[PDB]
């Protein structure tokens, strides 16, 4: 029924900064709704048109329910987010309908942007200490600071950990361990995570004992109210998820944002408005997540002219719609003064990113620190020699970002 392009939608060779994988253009040329080959077997359908994508992502017939995914995917697709049944109610990405609204209710007050903003000075301090350490190591060594491994994931990880009351001192070890717990929680096979698990449980114990209106306290109070009774293990599971959600995507994006700033594309006298417009363009141009998470048709659906069967796995093309010439003049150029137009980098519909305000705050705070404390920071290699890639369902990321910070 649909036009068919017989390729894996996740195919990604090593890319330059300015280019996006060829599959996006081949899908868009085929039609608004394109059959493709799902990586773990059978068909999948990609949505290549912005307006249609917005309709799909708000249509209750397309659901996250991982039980609708083909049998062949279980244990293999790894892009499939499939908690054990009893943990799906605690997993924002695994539910829709009333169960999803409940979790949105629990998370909303915890991400109150007024409360995040009170943390700006701490966020700056975090970034500034990480950068001073990196500059000092480069002074001693004679080697450029490598900001992907030394900054991009560490900075957002330390922010979200501190917001949740989880006192991490080694972000590299924490990043590895929360990755393991994420994979286990979302249904992967099967390594030592006990140190991190101790800190997560300590943050939950502390949330229950103390009335201080922090993030984890508010999650606790609101989950207790909605579920009647919530266990320490359930809260640990929920905060594990927000640690991973809060750092991986953000850290992938920040590597790209850093590259564009350090390439000298931000005006030297840029005011706050110009900075936030620069961040906005970077979110259009370098989305870390190329497709929405899997949705499945709950019934037979005809959409954009095409008949999709019950069970049909559907992807919205974020990277391709963000760089569609039908809505963006010179879609593959980086133009921060471009008129502001919508993008799909944070999703749409009920499952829209709950972290967007935080990710923005972190972005603009990082640039402030850089501009004020490392005004001469530059790339240690040309912008045209930077490369990025992604395998499978992982976020897009630079291979490295070598910088002379001062
Ligand atoms: C630039 C950084 C980030 C980007 C690009 C990003 C992108 C996205 C996208 C595309 C989705 C929706 C997925 C879908 O519905 O298919 C989403 C959801 C989500 N994000 Fe973000 N995100 C970012 C930062 C953050 C941060 C800082 C947090 C904090 C914990 C967060 C937590 C979440 C959560 C929990 C969801 C699930 C919402 C739902 O299913 O209801 N994210 N993100
Ligand atoms: C793009 C936004 C995002 O999907 C949000 C998100 C998320 O909301 C949750 C968790 C996440 O891991 C993620 C992220 O998802 C991963 C896995 C996906 N297959 C895909 O590879 C994507 C790029 O990364 C990011 C959790 O891992 C999780 C959890 O893990 C055990 C426990 C409770 C809730 C969540 C929970 O809500």
From Swiss-Prot:
Keyword Flavoprotein: no
A Pfam family annotated for this UniProt entry: p450
Family: Belongs to the cytochrome P450 family.
Protein name: Cytochrome P-450 monooxygenase DoxA
Subunit-level organization: Monomer.
Principal cellular location given in the protein's record: cytoplasm
Taxonomic lineage of the native organism: Bacteria, Bacillati, Actinomycetota, Actinomycetes, Kitasatosporales
GO terms under biological process: daunorubicin biosynthetic process
Pathway participation: Antibiotic biosynthesis; daunorubicin biosynthesis; Antibiotic biosynthesis; carminomycin biosynthesis
Keyword Cytoplasm: yes
InterPro entries: Cyt_P450, Cyt_P450_B, Cyt_P450_CS, Cyt_P450_sf
Catalysis performed (reactions): 13-deoxydaunorubicin + NADPH + O2 + H(+) = 13-dihydrodaunorubicin + NADP(+) + H2O; 13-dihydrodaunorubicin + NADPH + O2 + H(+) = daunorubicin + NADP(+) + 2 H2O; 13-deoxycarminomycin + NADPH + O2 + H(+) = 13-dihydrocarminomycin + NADP(+) + H2O; 13-dihydrocarminomycin + NADPH + O2 + H(+) = carminomycin + NADP(+) + 2 H2O
Cofactor(s) recorded in Swiss-Prot or TrEMBL: heme
Note: S.peucetius ATCC 29050 produces significant quantities of doxorubicin only when it grows in a highly-buffered doxorubicin production medium. S.peucetius subsp. caesius ATCC 27952, a mutant strain derived from S.peucetius ATCC 29050, is the only organism reported to produce doxorubicin in vivo.
EC class: oxidoreductase
Record-listed E.C. numbers: 1.14.13.181
Binding sites annotated in the UniProt record for heme: 353
Function summary: Involved in the biosynthesis of the anthracyclines carminomycin and daunorubicin (daunomycin) which are aromatic polyketide antibiotics that exhibit high cytotoxicity and are widely applied in the chemotherapy of a variety of cancers.
Subcellular location: Cytoplasm
Signal peptide: none
A GO CC term attached to the entry: cytoplasm
């Amino acid at each position: 029924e649909a036009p068919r392009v017989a390729v894996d939608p996740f195919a990604c060779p090593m890319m330059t900064m300015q280019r996006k994988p060829e599959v996006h253009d081949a899908f868009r040329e085929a039609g608004p709704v394109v059959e493709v080959n799902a990586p773990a077997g059978g068909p999948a359908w990609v949505i290549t048109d912005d307006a249609l994508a917005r309709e799909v992502l708000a249509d209750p017939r397309f659901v996250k329910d991982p039980d609708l995914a083909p049998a062949a995917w279980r244990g293999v697709d790894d892009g499939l987010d499939i908690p054990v049944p009893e943990l799906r109610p605690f997993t924002l990405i695994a539910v829709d309908g009333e169960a999803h609204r409940r979790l949105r209710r629990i998370h909303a007050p915890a991400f109150n942007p007024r409360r995040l903003a009170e943390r700006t000075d701490r966020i700056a301090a975090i970034a500034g200490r990480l950068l001073t350490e990196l500059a000092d190591a480069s002074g001693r060594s004679g080697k450029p600071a490598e900001l992907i491994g030394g900054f991009a994931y560490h900075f957002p990880l330390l922010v979200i950990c501190e917001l949740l009351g989880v006192p991490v001192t080694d972000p590299a070890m924490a990043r590895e361990a929360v990755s393991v717990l994420k994979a286990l929680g979302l249904g992967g096979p099967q390594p030592d995570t006990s140190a991190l698990e101790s800190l997560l449980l300590e943050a939950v114990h502390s949330a229950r004992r103390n009335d201080t209106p922090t993030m984890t306290r508010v999650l606790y109070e609101r989950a207790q109210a909605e579920f009647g009774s919530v266990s320490d293990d359930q809260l640990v599971y929920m905060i594990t998820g927000l640690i991973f959600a809060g750092h991986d995507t953000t850290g992938s994006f920040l590597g790209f944002l850093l590259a564009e700033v350090l390439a000298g594309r931000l005006a030297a006298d840029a005011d706050e408005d110009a900075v936030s417009r620069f961040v906005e363009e970077a979110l259009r141009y370098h989305p870390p997540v190329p497709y929405t998470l899997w949705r499945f048709a709950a019934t037979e659906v005809t959409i954009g002219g095409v008949r999709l069967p019950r069970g049909a796995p559907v992807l919205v093309d974020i990277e391709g719609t963000n760089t569609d010439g039908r809505h963006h003049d010179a879609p593959h150029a980086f133009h921060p003064d471009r008129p502001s137009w919508r993008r799909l980098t944070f999703g749409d519909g009920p499952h829209y990113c709950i972290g967007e305000q935080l990710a923005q705050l972190e972005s603009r705070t990082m640039i402030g620190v850089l501009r004020s404390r490392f005004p001469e920071a530059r790339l240690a290699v040309p912008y045209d020699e930077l490369r990025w890639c992604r395998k499978g369902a992982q976020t897009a990321r630079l291979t490295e970002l070598p910088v002379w910070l001062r």
